[PDB]
Design a protein around this nucleic acid. Sequence first.
DNA 1: ACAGGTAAGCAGTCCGCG
DNA 2: GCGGACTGCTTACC
Length: 899
Amino acid sequence: MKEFYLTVEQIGDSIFERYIDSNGRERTREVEYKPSLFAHCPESQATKYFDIYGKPCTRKLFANMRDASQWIKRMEDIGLEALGMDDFKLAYLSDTYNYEIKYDHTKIRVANFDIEVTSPDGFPEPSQAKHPIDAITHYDSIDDRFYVFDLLNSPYGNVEEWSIEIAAKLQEQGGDEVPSEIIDKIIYMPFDNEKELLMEYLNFWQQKTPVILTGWNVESFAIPYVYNRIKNIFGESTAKRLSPHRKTRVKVIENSREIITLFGISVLDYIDLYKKFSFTNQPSYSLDYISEFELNVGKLKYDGPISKLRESNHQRYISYNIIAVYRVLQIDAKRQFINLSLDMGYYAKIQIQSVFSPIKTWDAIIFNSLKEQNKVIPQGRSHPVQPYPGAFVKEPIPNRYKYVMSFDLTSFYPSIIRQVNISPETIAGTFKVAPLHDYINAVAERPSDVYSCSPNGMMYYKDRDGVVPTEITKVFNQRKEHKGYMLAAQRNGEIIKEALHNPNLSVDEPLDVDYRFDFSDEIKEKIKKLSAKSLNEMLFRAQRTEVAGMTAQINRKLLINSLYGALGNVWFRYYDLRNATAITTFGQMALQWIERKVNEYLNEVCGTEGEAFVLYGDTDSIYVSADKIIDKVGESKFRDTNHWVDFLDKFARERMEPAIDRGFREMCEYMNNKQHLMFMDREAIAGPPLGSKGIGGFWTGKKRYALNVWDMEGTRYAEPKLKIMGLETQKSSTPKAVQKALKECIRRMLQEGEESLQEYFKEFEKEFRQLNYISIASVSSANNIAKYDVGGFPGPKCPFHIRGILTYNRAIKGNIDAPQVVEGEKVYVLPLREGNPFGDKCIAWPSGTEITDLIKDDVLHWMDYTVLLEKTFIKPLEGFTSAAKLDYEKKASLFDMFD
DNA sequence: ACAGGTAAGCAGTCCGCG
DNA sequence: GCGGACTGCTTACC
Ligand SMILES: O=c1ccn([C@H]2C[C@H](O)[C@@H](COP(=O)(O)NP(=O)(O)OP(=O)(O)O)O2)c(=O)[nH]1
Ligand SMILES: [Ca+2]
Ligand SMILES: [Ca+2]
Ligand SMILES: [Ca+2]
Ligand code: NA
Ligand code: NA
Ligand code: NA
Ligand code: NA
Ligand code: NA
Ligand code: NA
Ligand code: NA
Ligand code: NA
């Protein structure tokens, strides 16, 4: 096979690389890499090197990387540009791997690990590491084995060995329910003291040195705790064995927190992968909470605090450590963020951990692209941060909206880049700008008949291929492929959901099918003959396939959109507000241009004049009122809901879209752009069920609306799905039970009508005081707690949730065991009734947890349900209903005086 | 440091206001 | 005594 790197590091004048060779074997080499950099040279000097603007350069070869760095400094002291890749690791990778890297993941050692540390005096700070590590579970992807290191003897208690027999048993048997599929993969190792455990773990680490190191909070806890514990016991030299090159770096942050860099290892903390690639915002990021959300597994159960779990139930203590490791593996099997990181890393030719940085990622992609044409990248430059304009958002008229069709553009900003040909080296000049509405209304004079233009005043060459459009197109094409798999899996899911209405009472097996492609008629025929058992399993596999496609497509979209963003970041080598503004301004034009065209077209085909069909728009999307399109045929002519949905689906696809296409083609000609790439397709078809009292949808303002959708991007839902954007139901800060209640309120409004809403509201008001306290607690991030802490009491302008944290700290003051609120993390927040013993109007505690038993009964007694209801529930419901012009309570009338 | 701008709602402080 | 304007903070949409 073709060789590929695993890790790369620069240590002085040496490049340390771990790699898989042509025979599939892992090797490590030290290379005294000789880097090249470039300087501008006279035009009379023949050369094959030119900067991106066509200016000749000469290559400077250096004896070592230090000499190259020193040359950069001297060139700065002179005041001349030093061109070329200044990150020598990237240059080395580009030189060593001058081809499209095809990698074998089975050869890459991916380690998942988690440690346990018993601490009687609160959280065990990794920088201090003063408590023994009494458990380590380390999963190796090559061995496919869970290596368990169990400390039997500790100053905090001596315990018996963990039993794998009891671990495998059901909880109803007094067992731990360690999943049966990993029982045979567990390698258990007990130790009679910590030093022997740690020394053995280090020897194990050397035999099976991780390339990718992951787990949950491993970067902020596990890794620095292990490193510091070993350092304090054996000394620094021994602790450095955690690095295959014996090189570590301790980066410190004083509040005393440390993040350790282990040279020769690529750490991908799964919590960071999750936060960056999952596109969620969670009320809590404990592994317990995320596992429940992602996998629908039950919360792990135990009696008493975790600080005494080992002493009381060491059996369960070890089993849960093992399970914790497995849960992350299970989450990755679903989300596949590791696969994504490897894909993007090898594509860009970067250190795998650099997938967290789209700027580093794009710098390497662009550098490799340019290097292939003997072109020389410019030197990075210092720039001041400056604001610049973005997208346009229309101000909607707050109202209900019965029938709605939405449209938006495919990969908006990257498509603008490709269409206009926006790149650092394709800039041709400028023109005099007319007001933006003059271009929107096709009144302003044509910017140029030679160059491709944006209404911000920028002109670009039409003939030349720009490196930014060239490379963004490649990644965009990957994105488009994976989205196809996602939507097909999604459409397949609905087919299965339909067949789950007539499950055949028989015994069979799920059909072997590739869910990435639309089911063939043969498959569909067989599906209508399957048992509920097989169908539900197929639905599970379809949804897993969809999530896999979702991860692949949405994060490639994120990457290309971040290339747009990078143009507006001063640390990007190709930072340029001219290009960034060219993109957003063109986008503003395009949206408001097509709003006009759509309005004009619909009035024409309907026969009316001057009526507003586009009720709302944001960035690249429009929302079209389809009431008059429906009324043109009259509701009577429709058999059922699905009939008019088919009608609108056809109408948009056969009539509106071609008109939209003509409109954008004209705009492309107007701006004399390189290639027409404004592709606007139908998104949602929304409306009430036929013959119902549902209102279909409503807007309360910008970025706040709800729609009862029947079809979304070609997916015909088995049951109508609510599309709610911005409303409190969508916010992680809104209490769980309130989200649920508000959503059902919205469902009833859009699908059933006012009377249904009023029934549900009355019921919720009566019964809500029985809801679990966690389900009705608000959530908030806890930033700058100390900033507002004046002697344990709220300082000036102390935020509500911060006030609640201070209340908590006073209540638990003097308890070294009580859970402490962590700066930057999230808290549950509850209001307290007047005269409560806590001395304040609210209290907060670490999210994802039960509040400590020290004060739990007191908090439950003094919760302010009244404030909770009015503030979190009634107030936003009032906003929904006022906009929709409805009432959630029966109003008073003259009829009230009849019996 | 190490993708971007737009925009919503909640709550605290201050100032005008017989 | 507190409404309205303004600010900080948080978390959305795109
Ligand atoms: O995170 C984002 C999201 C959107 N945007 C900008 C660029 C994007 O093209 C534009 C439209 O947002 P969309 O939600 O429509 N995503 P996009 O148009 O890129 O892709 P697609 O609609 O094909 O999925 O808003 C960002 O800059 N960052
Ligand atoms: Ca011993
Ligand atoms: Ca779009
Ligand atoms: Ca059937
Ligand atoms: Na743990
Ligand atoms: Na059970
Ligand atoms: Na130390
Ligand atoms: Na689309
Ligand atoms: Na007319
Ligand atoms: Na959009
Ligand atoms: Na189309
Ligand atoms: Na879409």
